[PDB]
Amino acid sequence: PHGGGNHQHIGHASTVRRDAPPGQKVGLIAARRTGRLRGQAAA
Amino acid sequence: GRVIRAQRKGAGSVFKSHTHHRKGPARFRSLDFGERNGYLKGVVTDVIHDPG
Amino acid sequence: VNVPKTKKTYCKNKECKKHTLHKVTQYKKGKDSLSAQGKRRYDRKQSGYGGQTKPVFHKKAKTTKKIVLKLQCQSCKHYSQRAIKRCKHFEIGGDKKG
Amino acid sequence: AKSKNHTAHNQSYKAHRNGIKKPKRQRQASTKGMDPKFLRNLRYSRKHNV
RNA sequence: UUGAAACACGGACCAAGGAGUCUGACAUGCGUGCGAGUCGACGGGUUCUGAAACCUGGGAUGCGCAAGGAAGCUGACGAGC
RNA sequence: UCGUUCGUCUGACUUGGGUAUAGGGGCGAAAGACUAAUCGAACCAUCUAGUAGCUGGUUCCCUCCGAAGUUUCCCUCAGGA
RNA sequence: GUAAGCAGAACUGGCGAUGCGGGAUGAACCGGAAGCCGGGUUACGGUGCCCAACUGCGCGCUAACCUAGAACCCACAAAGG
RNA sequence: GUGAUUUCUGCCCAGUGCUCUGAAUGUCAAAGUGAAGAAAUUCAACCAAGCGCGGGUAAACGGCGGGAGUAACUAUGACUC
RNA sequence: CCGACUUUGUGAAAUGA
RNA sequence: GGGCGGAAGACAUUGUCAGGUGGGGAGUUUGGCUGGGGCGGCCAAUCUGUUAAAAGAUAACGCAGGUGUCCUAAGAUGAGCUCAACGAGAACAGAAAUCUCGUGUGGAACAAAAGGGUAAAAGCUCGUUUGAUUCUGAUUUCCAGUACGAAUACGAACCGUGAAAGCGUGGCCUAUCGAUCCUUUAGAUCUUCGGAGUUUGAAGCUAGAGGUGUCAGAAAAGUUACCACAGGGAUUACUGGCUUGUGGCAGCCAAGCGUUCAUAGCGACGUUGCUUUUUGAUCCUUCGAUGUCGGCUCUUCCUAUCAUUGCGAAGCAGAAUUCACCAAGUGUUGGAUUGUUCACCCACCAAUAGGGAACGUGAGCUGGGUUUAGACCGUCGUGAGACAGGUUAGUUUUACCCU
RNA sequence: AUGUAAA
RNA sequence: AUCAGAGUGGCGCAGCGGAAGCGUGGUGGGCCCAUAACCCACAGGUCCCAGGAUCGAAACCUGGCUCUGAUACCA
Ligand SMILES: [Mg+2]
Ligand SMILES: [Mg+2]
Ligand SMILES: [Mg+2]
Ligand SMILES: [Mg+2]
Ligand SMILES: [Mg+2]
Ligand SMILES: [Mg+2]
Ligand SMILES: [Mg+2]
Ligand SMILES: [Mg+2]
Ligand SMILES: [Mg+2]
Ligand SMILES: [Mg+2]
Ligand SMILES: [Mg+2]
Ligand SMILES: [Mg+2]
Ligand SMILES: [Mg+2]
Ligand SMILES: [Mg+2]
Ligand SMILES: [Mg+2]
Ligand SMILES: [Mg+2]
Ligand SMILES: [Mg+2]
Ligand SMILES: [Mg+2]
Ligand SMILES: [Mg+2]
Ligand SMILES: [Mg+2]
Ligand SMILES: [Mg+2]
Ligand SMILES: [Mg+2]
Ligand SMILES: [Mg+2]
Ligand SMILES: [Mg+2]
Ligand SMILES: [Mg+2]
Ligand SMILES: [Mg+2]
Ligand SMILES: [Mg+2]
Ligand SMILES: [Mg+2]
Ligand SMILES: [Mg+2]
Ligand SMILES: [Mg+2]
Ligand SMILES: [Mg+2]
Ligand SMILES: [Mg+2]
Ligand SMILES: [Mg+2]
Ligand SMILES: [Mg+2]
Ligand SMILES: [Mg+2]
Ligand SMILES: [Mg+2]
Ligand SMILES: [Mg+2]
Ligand SMILES: [Mg+2]
Ligand SMILES: [Mg+2]
Ligand SMILES: [Mg+2]
Ligand SMILES: [Mg+2]
Ligand SMILES: [Mg+2]
Ligand SMILES: [Mg+2]
Ligand SMILES: [Mg+2]
Ligand SMILES: [Mg+2]
Ligand SMILES: [Mg+2]
Ligand SMILES: [Mg+2]
Ligand SMILES: [Mg+2]
Ligand SMILES: [Mg+2]
Ligand SMILES: [Mg+2]
Ligand SMILES: [Mg+2]
Ligand SMILES: [Mg+2]
Ligand SMILES: [Mg+2]
Ligand SMILES: [Mg+2]
Ligand SMILES: [Mg+2]
Ligand SMILES: [Mg+2]
Ligand SMILES: [Mg+2]
Ligand SMILES: [Mg+2]
Ligand SMILES: [Mg+2]
Ligand SMILES: [Mg+2]
Ligand SMILES: [Mg+2]
Ligand SMILES: [Mg+2]
Ligand SMILES: [Zn+2]
C-alpha cells in the first residue's frame, strides 16, 4: 500500500483500522495514538 | 496488485522457524501427586545454550 | 404564479356537462405501492447477484416541474386535472395584486 | 478532420435528372379539408337527388 | 485517394493451390401446376438394378377463405360519377 | 562472446548435491527484478474459424445502361440507416 | 484572414469517371467529347530550324555596354526616375 | 517509518485518518411485539453494531499568511496600526 | 464487526407486562 | 465411592438469514465538436438582426445579442381616455413635488434579446370576468414532406363579455422545451384475473404528471515514462511546397539635424518594394519509418563586400575615418566559460564579413544535450503519477549491389 | 510610564 | 496571453437595492507642573470611472482604468 510515487512517501494515514482486510492492514494497526511518548502516556 | 510480504508469512514456506539445532522444548515437568502434596528432588546436570 | 382558490370551467361528467364552480387544489404524487407489477418484477430482478440491474438516472437539468391543478366541481364532486407552465414559485389563493 | 460540410453543389442537376415533376391535374379535385358544414350539406343534397 | 510514373505501400522468378458459399426466415420479380382452394412435407401400402418410383389419408394439419377491439365482444343489409 | 583495464577476496564469503515455495501464485538487501533465450502476470492445449465501424486481397469475354461525396436522424464525425 | 496551392458559403460548368488536338511539360486552361476504316474540311493553335505549314505581301515602333523581347490560365514585378 | 556517531528535532488535532467513551429523549435491519382487517397486508412501538454527538492523537497523512505607517541628512526600520 | 434463530438443557431473583 | 484430572459453561463455537464496513480483490466506464489532441468555449436543444448575393434555401470556434423564465393578470372582453417630450402660467416651489391651458405621427408604453406591429389602440384608467375550458380530426413552420415543440383555420359543445355586431381555444407576432419501459393521478355506476360466484388485491382502456439540457432521450473517475493492438499521412512534432504578418535587406517624398546648409553623412510624419538563414499561419507530400541538437571533418556555391586590387564623393590639409561603384580572384585564426546554435571576453591579425547546399554532412565519427526503462530534489496531486523545472547513470547495426 | 541641547 | 479576484474615511477593513460604518488616526475641552495613557464631546467619504435597467444603487449587467493569484502540456 505504501509503494509508488515520484517521491517516497506514504500519501495516506499510516494508521489503519483494526477491521482492515489482510493485505490492507500495514502500518500502525489500530493505533490509539502516535508520535513521541511524553509525560503521562510514557508512564 | 500482488500478495504482499506480510500476507506471505502465514503460508509457512520459507518463513518457518529455523529449529534444526534447538535442544527441545523448555518447560516444567508434568504435574503429579508428588508435586501436589510434597516435594520431588532434582539435580541440575548441565547449563546449556539453546540456539534461537 | 398565483391561482384562485375556486374557478368556473367546464365539467365533463355526464351529470354536469357544463360550466360549474370548481375547487382548486394541487396534485401530489401518490406514494408508490410495493405490489405494482413493475415494482414486483424489479424486486425479483434485483434479488441475488449481479448488482444494480436497471439504470439509475443522474443527469438532472430541469429546475422546475409542471404544476398540476386538481379541479373538483361542486355539483358532482369529481375531479379534473390540468397542468400549467413550469414555474418556480407557485401559490393557490394567495393575496391578490394591488 | 474538419467534419462539417454543406453545399448545394450538384443538387439542381440531380433534381432535373427525372424532371421537376408536377402532379397530374385532376377532374373532380379532392374535398378533404374543406368546411365540414359545407361538406355535410353537399352529401345530403346528393343523397336526395332524383 | 481530390489527386500515383511517384521520394506512397505490395510485387526477384516459375508451377500448383487460393476468396460472396451452404443453411433457416422473409420479400419483390419470373416460370410451372392446380384454383376458393391448395399443399401428402409426420405416417401407412407397395416397389426384385432403385434410400427411387407409384398409391393412400384431410370431414377441417399449415396457409388462404373476414375484420375491428386491450378485452368482454360484435362481425361487412349488396355503388355511383 | 573476446582483449586490455577494473571490483572483492575470513566474510551479510564462493560453490556442488538434496529439499521446500507454482501463475493474480511463488520469490524478491526492491530493479516490476526473477520464475528454463518467454514476465507490468510463464508455458501448453482447448473454448476458437473469438470480435474488428479498421488494413490487405477478391479469378473469363463482349454488348447495353450508368452514379455519388448532398438531406434528416443516430455517444453520430474512418460507421449506419 | 496580412496572406496562402488557406478556411467557409451562393449559381453554373468541369475533373473525379475521359481518351483525343493545342498551351514545350501539367486532372480540371483553349478546342472538342470517341465503334473499325477510306476520302474531304475544319476548331484551338500555328507556318526560320527542331516540327506539318510563307524566311509570303504591307505600315510603323524598338537597338537592350541589365541574359533586349517574344503564349489566356502562367509561372510577378511596385512606388519613383 | 527513519537511517552510524555528533548537535537538534519548533508551532498546528480546524480537514483526512486512527482511536477512546455511551446518560439518554437522533437516526439506524432481520427476527420478535401491538393494533386494524375476512385474509393477503398495512400501520405503530421497538431496533445491535455503524454514523452523528463528546474527548485524544503530528517520530499519523499532512500544513506551517497578508496590507499600511514609523528614528532630527539620506537610506533602513528596533517600533506602531 | 453486529443481531436473531439453531445448537440449547436445568432453576432463582428484580423491575416488566 | 460405576467421575482420568482440571478451566470455562448453556456463554463460546457451528449452521442459516439480517445490517454495517470492506480498492484486500472482481468486472466495467471514464461523450462529441475542435484549423492535430489537450486546456478553454458550446457554435449539440434554441430565438432576433446581419453575413445572405431584392423568391425560398444557404457555411465557419462568423458578427451583435437572447433562451431553460415570468404573469389570476402581464389571460378575456367592454367603455372612457391619450403617450414621450416641449411652450406658457400658479404661496412656500427652485433643474426637479402639485395644478392649468396650448402644441404634440408616437419621438412613449406594450414582463424579458432583437426585429416587426399598434393612437376613440395592442398603450393608460375603470367595470365585468376565467376561451389559460371539452372532443377528436386538418393544415402551416421543421421536414424524410416522420415525430416533438409551437402556431393557424374550420366542425361539435359549454361559457365570458358587450346594447349589439363581434371578440375570446392563454400572453401583440417571431424562442421559453421532452419517446419507449416504469411509477403516479383522473375519468366509466367500463373490461379481465380463463370452473362459477361474492369480494380485497392486481392487470387493462383514455387522458395528464414524475426526464432524459450530449435537449430523437447509455446507468459511469483517473493514470501509464512498464505499456499493447488495429489503423491514420483524413492528423501533430523535422526537411520540402504556398504566404510573408514577424524576422532581414532596400527604395521614394522631404519636416528637420548636420556650429549657417533638406539631400557630404543622415532622415521624422508618410509611403513602395525585395528576400526566404527566423517565427507564425497552413496541413499538400511522407506514420507496412526519409535516423531528429551541436561539434568535428571535407567540398562546393551565393553576394546583401569585412580585408585584399582599381576607382568615384566628403563637413578628404596630412594620418585616420565615412558613403558609393566595378568586383566573390584570395583570405576570414588561437583560446577561457557553456552540450549549446547564439553569446561574451582574452589575444593575434590586413580582416577576424554575412549566408546556402534535406536548418549540407550519424552504413563519416562523436553521444555532451535532448529522447524509454534506474534514481534524487522542488512545486502540483488523496493517490497512481505530472512537470516546455533542476540532477545523475543509461546498446549508435549492415555495403560484397547499382551508380 | 516619562521629563531643557538651550548652561 | 487569457481568465478569476479586489478597488468604500488618513490607513487596514466590513457593508443582501429604505441609502455608510468597525478598529485606529484627526479636531476641541478635561485630568497633569507638563506629555503620554485615561475621560467627555465634534468632524470626516470624487463608494475606481462612464453607462444602462431599476419603486429606488456603493451593491445588478455592460463597457473603460489600476493592483493580485492562476493555467499554459506531447513533440
Ligand atoms: Mg494496492
Ligand atoms: Mg507512495
Ligand atoms: Mg523515483
Ligand atoms: Mg502532498
Ligand atoms: Mg428469489
Ligand atoms: Mg441477497
Ligand atoms: Mg462529409
Ligand atoms: Mg492524401
Ligand atoms: Mg516526388
Ligand atoms: Mg498501408
Ligand atoms: Mg518489396
Ligand atoms: Mg491454378
Ligand atoms: Mg385444408
Ligand atoms: Mg569487456
Ligand atoms: Mg583473488
Ligand atoms: Mg581476482
Ligand atoms: Mg549452494
Ligand atoms: Mg540448492
Ligand atoms: Mg519504476
Ligand atoms: Mg474468417
Ligand atoms: Mg480508409
Ligand atoms: Mg474516388
Ligand atoms: Mg481524315
Ligand atoms: Mg513516521
Ligand atoms: Mg516534527
Ligand atoms: Mg488535525
Ligand atoms: Mg483529528
Ligand atoms: Mg424490524
Ligand atoms: Mg446504536
Ligand atoms: Mg479494480
Ligand atoms: Mg475528439
Ligand atoms: Mg486546437
Ligand atoms: Mg437571390
Ligand atoms: Mg432572400
Ligand atoms: Mg378600446
Ligand atoms: Mg408538426
Ligand atoms: Mg368560437
Ligand atoms: Mg396584453
Ligand atoms: Mg412525460
Ligand atoms: Mg400502468
Ligand atoms: Mg383460474
Ligand atoms: Mg440529438
Ligand atoms: Mg484503465
Ligand atoms: Mg509521462
Ligand atoms: Mg516579409
Ligand atoms: Mg516586416
Ligand atoms: Mg495531408
Ligand atoms: Mg506537415
Ligand atoms: Mg511518418
Ligand atoms: Mg530507412
Ligand atoms: Mg517509405
Ligand atoms: Mg537516407
Ligand atoms: Mg554586387
Ligand atoms: Mg548519411
Ligand atoms: Mg548522454
Ligand atoms: Mg529515466
Ligand atoms: Mg523531469
Ligand atoms: Mg565500405
Ligand atoms: Mg521616551
Ligand atoms: Mg529615555
Ligand atoms: Mg486631547
Ligand atoms: Mg494631554
Ligand atoms: Zn361536475
**CA-wise closest residue to C63 among C87, C27, C29:** C87
The grid cell for C24 is 382548486
What SS3 state is found at C57? coil
Cα D47 to Cα D50: distance, rounded to the nearest angstrom: 9
Interface residues 5-24 of B with strand F (CB < 7 Å):
5, 7-8, 11, 13-15
Residue B32 burial by Cβ neighbours in a 10 Å radius (0-12, 13-18, 19+): exposed
* Interface mutation vs chain B, best among A16, A26, A28, A29, most B CBs within 10 Å: A26
The grid cell for A13 is 494515514
Cα C84 to Cα C27: distance, rounded to the nearest angstrom: 12
Breaks (C–N over 2.5 Å) after residues, chain A: none
Which one of B1, B3, B6 has the shortest CB-CB distance to A26? B6
Angle among Cα B34, B39, B41 to the nearest 5 degrees reads 105
Cα C90 to Cα C69: distance, rounded to the nearest angstrom: 11
Q: What's at B4, amino acid-wise?
A: I
Q: List chain A residues with CB under 8 Å of B7.
A: 22-23
- B22 contacts B51 by C-beta, under 8 angstroms: yes
Cα D24 to Cα D5: distance, rounded to the nearest angstrom: 37
The grid cell for C49 is 447477484
Q: What's at C82, amino acid-wise?
A: R
Angle among Cα C14, C70, C63 to the nearest 5 degrees reads 145
- C70 membership: H or E segment, kind and range: strand C68-73
The pairing of strands C2-3 and C6-11 is unpaired
Task: Say what the alpha-carbon torsion angle B5, B9, B13, B19 is, to the nearest 10 degrees.
Answer: 130
- C69 contacts C6 by C-beta, under 8 angstroms: no
Cα C24 to Cα C5: distance, rounded to the nearest angstrom: 5
The pairing of strands C79-83 and C68-73 is antiparallel
